[PDB]
Amino acid sequence: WKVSERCLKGHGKFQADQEIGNGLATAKGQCKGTDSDQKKAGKCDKHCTGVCLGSGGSCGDGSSQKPNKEDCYCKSK
């Protein structure tokens, strides 16, 4: 799975040419701030499908796979 800088850091190059392997893409910072968990979930899922071009995603929950609550973790198609 290749994703863009925009996917990973939130801004930058648009084309999907960053290799992340077989795991999730870390969309840094997409779940930061004071919005509700539901609203953050929507922002994250749409960043994942619309920018990372994955199937969906979810905010960090402290697990090994999704360790940072401020980050959004996107799954491939």
Q: What is the resolution of this structure in A?
A: 1.1
Report CA-CA distances (Å) from 28 to 33, 36, 64, 71: 13, 18, 16, 5
Judge contact between 51 and 44, C-beta under 8 A: no
- C-alpha R_g of the chain: 11
Per domain, the residue ranges of the chain are 1-77
Q: Residue 3 forms beta bridges with which residues?
A: 18
- List the determination method: X-ray
